[PDB]
């Protein structure tokens, strides 16, 4: 049974509730954005109305063959009338085809889903700015602070440069991005552009990212692992026993690999700075943790809500422990005293 912070109150709306059967009152189903814990559920045989981005309803016809005639993709940034109520699609600064969605209800309720999202000063100049909104469903996946990392730009000038460094000193040396689901796609295309590289990738894959809008896309990718020295690997194989397999599958082409996990954050961001960070070694093969996010550290998610100013705040993640809900709702009555709302 679909949880409460999944409905929509005043309409007949759910937002990514795929994984309970027919839930009793839905009208529509709307799909922020492809990431399997948001998606779980979906496939050919759905035949209720998705709402969702292009980009993601590119991914659903493709990738788990949902009909056509039950896709419904929005243009972002634009008022829809959805059976009867306004809604807006909204970048989410998440990963590509990523929307939060602004629900206008009947009664004069504004709601904002956020989506997963990563916060953003851009943010306070969409169409947020132009009216008041009192219910806000919240991505709080990194809602306490000690979450913090660096912007998306000092971690790709760090793999960038880490990247052109070792293959300058080694032109022999593979690169290896590991990847899991889309987002992220940065890290793997900035390193390729330096290094005057296509990036090389399994046809599942390459099928993944020609559904994504990508200018110039044919331009950046290919299946052809031997004409590439930039590879993709799934996220598992990325350790020593892995990425030892898989140079010797490469002939003799290369005799070192640098290796790249984007992750979210880890621990050593407690300590570390982006320009201190090392890898492990082993050998010939070197590992690099990187803390590429794709939500909200905690100092942006509170800039976005004490600017925003919502009459309630329900939250999306680390909703199932007391723990965790105490401590969320204690930062949230924080936030508003300090900002006085
Ligand atoms: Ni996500």
Same mark, same amino acid.
């Given at each position: 049974?679909?949880?409460? $912070?999944?409905?929509?109150?005043? /309409?007949?709306? /759910?937002?990514? &509730?795929?994984?309970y059967?027919?839930v009793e009152?839905?009208? !529509?189903?709307?799909?922020?954005?492809?990431?399997?814990?948001?998606?779980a559920?979906?496939?050919?045989?759905?035949?209720?109305?998705? $709402?969702?981005? +292009?980009i993601?309803?590119?991914?659903?016809?493709?990738?788990?063959?949902? =009909?056509? =005639?039950?896709?419904?993709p929005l243009?972002?940034?634009? +008022?829809?009338?959805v059976?009867?109520?306004?809604?807006?699609?909204?970048? &989410?600064?998440?990963?590509?085809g990523?929307v939060?969605?602004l629900?206008?209800?009947?009664?004069?309720?504004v709601?904002?889903?956020?989506?997963?999202?990563? !916060?953003?000063?851009?943010?306070?100049?969409?169409?947020?700015?132009?009216?008041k909104?009192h219910?806000?469903?919240?991505?709080?996946?990194?809602?306490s602070?000690? $979450?913090?990392?660096?912007?998306? =730009?000092?971690?790709?000038?760090? !793999?960038?440069?880490? !990247?052109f460094?070792?293959?300058?000193?080694?032109p022999?040396?593979?690169?290896?991005?590991?990847? $899991?689901?889309?987002g @992220?796609?940065?890290?793997?295309?900035?390193?390729?552009?330096?290094?005057? %590289?296509?990036?090389?990738?399994?046809?599942? @894959?390459?099928?993944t990212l020609?559904?994504?809008?990508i200018?110039?896309?044919?331009s950046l990718?290919?299946t052809?692992?031997?004409?590439?020295?930039?590879h993709?690997?799934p996220?598992?194989?990325?350790?020593?026993?892995?990425?030892? %397999?898989?140079l010797?599958?490469?002939?003799?082409?290369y005799?070192?690999?640098?290796?790249?996990?984007?992750?979210?954050?880890?621990?050593?961001?407690?300590?570390?700075?982006? &320009?201190?960070?090392?890898?492990?070694?082993?050998?010939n093969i070197?590992?690099?943790?990187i803390?590429?996010?794709?939500h909200?550290?905690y100092?942006?998610?509170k800039?976005?809500?004490?600017?925003?100013?919502?009459?309630?705040?329900?939250?999306?993640?680390?909703v199932?422990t007391?723990?965790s809900?105490?401590?969320?709702?204690?930062?949230?009555?924080?936030?508003?005293?300090?900002a006085?709302?």
């Amino acid at each position: 049974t679909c949880p409460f $912070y999944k409905k929509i109150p005043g /309409t007949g709306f /759910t937002v990514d &509730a795929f994984q309970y059967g027919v839930v009793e009152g839905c009208t !529509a189903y709307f799909l922020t954005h492809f990431h399997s814990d948001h998606y779980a559920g979906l496939s050919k045989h759905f035949t209720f109305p998705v $709402y969702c981005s +292009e980009i993601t309803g590119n991914l659903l016809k493709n990738k788990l063959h949902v =009909q056509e =005639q039950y896709i419904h993709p929005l243009p972002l940034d634009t +008022e829809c009338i959805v059976n009867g109520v306004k809604v807006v699609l909204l970048d &989410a600064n998440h990963c590509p085809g990523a929307v939060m969605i602004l629900f206008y209800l009947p009664n004069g309720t504004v709601i904002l889903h956020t989506g997963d999202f990563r !916060a953003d000063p851009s943010m306070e100049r969409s169409l947020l700015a132009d009216q008041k909104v009192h219910m806000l469903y919240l991505d709080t996946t990194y809602c306490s602070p000690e $979450y913090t990392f660096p912007s998306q =730009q000092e971690v790709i000038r760090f !793999a960038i440069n880490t !990247a052109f460094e070792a293959v300058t000193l080694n032109p022999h040396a593979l690169v290896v991005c590991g990847t $899991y689901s889309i987002g @992220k796609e940065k890290v793997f295309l900035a390193i390729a552009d330096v290094l005057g %590289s296509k990036v090389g990738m399994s046809q599942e @894959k390459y099928k993944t990212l020609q559904c994504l809008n990508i200018p110039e896309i044919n331009s950046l990718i290919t299946t052809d692992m031997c004409s590439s020295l930039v590879h993709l690997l799934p996220m598992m194989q990325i350790n020593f026993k892995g990425l030892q %397999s898989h140079l010797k599958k490469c002939g003799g082409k290369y005799n070192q690999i640098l290796a790249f996990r984007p992750t979210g954050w880890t621990h050593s961001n407690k300590f570390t700075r982006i &320009a201190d960070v090392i890898p492990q070694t082993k050998g010939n093969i070197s590992i690099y943790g990187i803390p590429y996010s794709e939500h909200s550290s905690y100092l942006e998610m509170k800039r976005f809500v004490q600017w925003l100013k919502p009459q309630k705040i329900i939250p999306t993640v680390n909703v199932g422990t007391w723990k965790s809900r105490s401590t969320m709702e204690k930062y949230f009555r924080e936030w508003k005293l300090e900002a006085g709302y």
